Design a protein around this motif. Structure first.
Motif, mmCIF file in Angstrom:
data_model
loop_
_atom_site.group_PDB
_atom_site.id
_atom_site.type_symbol
_atom_site.label_atom_id
_atom_site.label_comp_id
_atom_site.label_asym_id
_atom_site.label_seq_id
_atom_site.Cartn_x
_atom_site.Cartn_y
_atom_site.Cartn_z
ATOM 1 N N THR A 176 44.538 33.511 46.751
ATOM 2 C CA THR A 176 45.447 34.082 47.747
ATOM 3 C C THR A 176 46.614 33.144 48.068
ATOM 4 O OG1 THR A 176 45.480 35.129 49.980
ATOM 5 C CG2 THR A 176 44.077 33.180 49.579
ATOM 6 N N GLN A 177 46.440 31.835 47.844
ATOM 7 C CA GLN A 177 47.499 30.837 48.096
ATOM 8 C C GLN A 177 48.818 31.178 47.406
ATOM 9 O OE1 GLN A 177 46.181 26.920 46.258
ATOM 10 N NE2 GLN A 177 44.799 28.297 45.129
ATOM 11 N N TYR A 178 48.740 31.925 46.295
ATOM 12 C CA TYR A 178 49.925 32.284 45.562
ATOM 13 C C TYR A 178 50.487 33.649 45.908
ATOM 14 C CZ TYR A 178 48.276 28.422 42.653
ATOM 15 O OH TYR A 178 47.824 27.202 42.217
ATOM 16 N N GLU A 179 49.820 34.374 46.800
ATOM 17 C CA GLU A 179 50.116 35.777 46.966
ATOM 18 C C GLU A 179 51.555 36.048 47.375
ATOM 19 O OE1 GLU A 179 46.805 38.244 48.495
ATOM 20 O OE2 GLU A 179 48.343 38.872 49.971
ATOM 21 N N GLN A 180 52.132 35.196 48.235
ATOM 22 C CA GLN A 180 53.519 35.379 48.645
ATOM 23 C C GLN A 180 54.548 35.238 47.530
ATOM 24 O OE1 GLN A 180 54.450 36.706 51.452
ATOM 25 N NE2 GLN A 180 56.659 36.359 51.437
ATOM 26 N N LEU A 181 54.209 34.546 46.434
ATOM 27 C CA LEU A 181 55.101 34.474 45.282
ATOM 28 C C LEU A 181 55.426 35.859 44.724
ATOM 29 C CD1 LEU A 181 53.738 31.290 43.375
ATOM 30 C CD2 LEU A 181 55.541 31.489 45.156
ATOM 31 N N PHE A 182 54.434 36.745 44.721
ATOM 32 C CA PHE A 182 54.630 38.119 44.281
ATOM 33 C C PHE A 182 55.606 38.908 45.136
ATOM 34 C CE2 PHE A 182 51.137 36.679 41.856
ATOM 35 C CZ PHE A 182 51.196 37.418 40.651
ATOM 36 N N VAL A 199 51.248 46.160 44.456
ATOM 37 C CA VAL A 199 50.938 44.923 43.707
ATOM 38 C C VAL A 199 50.191 43.938 44.600
ATOM 39 C CG1 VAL A 199 51.881 42.892 42.517
ATOM 40 C CG2 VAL A 199 52.740 45.177 41.981
ATOM 41 N N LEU A 200 50.691 43.686 45.820
ATOM 42 C CA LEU A 200 49.982 42.753 46.743
ATOM 43 C C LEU A 200 48.554 43.219 47.065
ATOM 44 C CD1 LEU A 200 52.912 41.897 49.263
ATOM 45 C CD2 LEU A 200 51.920 40.481 47.389
ATOM 46 N N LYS A 201 48.345 44.529 47.202
ATOM 47 C CA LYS A 201 46.985 45.062 47.429
ATOM 48 C C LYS A 201 46.056 44.808 46.210
ATOM 49 C CE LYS A 201 46.521 49.628 47.315
ATOM 50 N NZ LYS A 201 46.337 51.117 47.610
ATOM 51 N N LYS A 225 46.450 55.079 41.343
ATOM 52 C CA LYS A 225 47.935 55.076 41.163
ATOM 53 C C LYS A 225 48.279 54.382 39.853
ATOM 54 C CE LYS A 225 52.175 54.531 43.729
ATOM 55 N NZ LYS A 225 52.738 54.049 45.002
ATOM 56 N N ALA A 226 49.113 55.018 39.040
ATOM 57 C CA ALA A 226 49.607 54.425 37.809
ATOM 58 C C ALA A 226 50.377 53.144 38.115
ATOM 59 C CB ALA A 226 50.549 55.408 37.105
ATOM 60 N N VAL A 227 50.051 52.074 37.402
ATOM 61 C CA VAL A 227 50.728 50.763 37.598
ATOM 62 C C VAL A 227 52.265 50.827 37.472
ATOM 63 C CG1 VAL A 227 50.807 48.352 36.979
ATOM 64 C CG2 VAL A 227 48.661 49.564 36.782
ATOM 65 N N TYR A 228 52.770 51.601 36.531
ATOM 66 C CA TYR A 228 54.232 51.781 36.393
ATOM 67 C C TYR A 228 54.929 52.180 37.709
ATOM 68 C CZ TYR A 228 58.516 52.880 33.770
ATOM 69 O OH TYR A 228 59.804 52.900 33.262
ATOM 70 N N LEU A 229 54.196 52.896 38.557
ATOM 71 C CA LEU A 229 54.720 53.379 39.826
ATOM 72 C C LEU A 229 54.387 52.472 41.032
ATOM 73 C CD1 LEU A 229 53.769 57.130 39.573
ATOM 74 C CD2 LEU A 229 56.004 56.169 38.912
ATOM 75 N N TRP A 230 53.604 51.427 40.816
ATOM 76 C CA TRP A 230 53.243 50.562 41.929
ATOM 77 C C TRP A 230 54.455 49.913 42.588
ATOM 78 C CZ3 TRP A 230 48.498 47.100 40.248
ATOM 79 C CH2 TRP A 230 47.362 47.910 40.144
ATOM 80 N N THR A 231 54.489 49.964 43.921
ATOM 81 C CA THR A 231 55.469 49.175 44.671
ATOM 82 C C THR A 231 55.014 47.707 44.751
ATOM 83 O OG1 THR A 231 54.384 49.612 46.760
ATOM 84 C CG2 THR A 231 56.109 51.220 46.009
#
Length: 75
Positions: free
Chosen positions: A23-29, A11-13, A1-7
């Motif tokens: 992973t401690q920061y993952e919820q910031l995203f 991004v979290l995946k 999947k093209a990054v421009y189109l990522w939901t």
């Protein structure tokens, strides 16, 4: 999947796969609603404003973001 189109979910995946040791920061995203388009624009300083104040952690995440941009750009 093209990054421009990522939901945000895309991004979290990506984040779990490439920043699995931070992973401690993952919820910031999710909390900052970082889509692919945002991922391609964010700066090291954006990361520090989201709360990644630890330099070595922020460096590591930043490098993964740059790696992804490089993949995108070579395409």
């Amino acid at each position: 999947k093209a990054v421009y189109l990522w939901t945000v979910s895309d991004v979290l995946k990506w984040y779990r796969r490439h920043c699995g040791e931070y992973t401690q920061y993952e919820q910031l995203f999710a909390q900052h609603d970082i889509t692919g388009r945002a991922l391609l624009r964010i700066t090291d300083s954006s990361l520090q404003r989201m709360g990644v104040t630890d330099n070595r952690d922020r460096e590591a995440i930043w490098r993964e973001i740059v790696k992804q941009r490089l993949k995108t750009d070579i395409m």
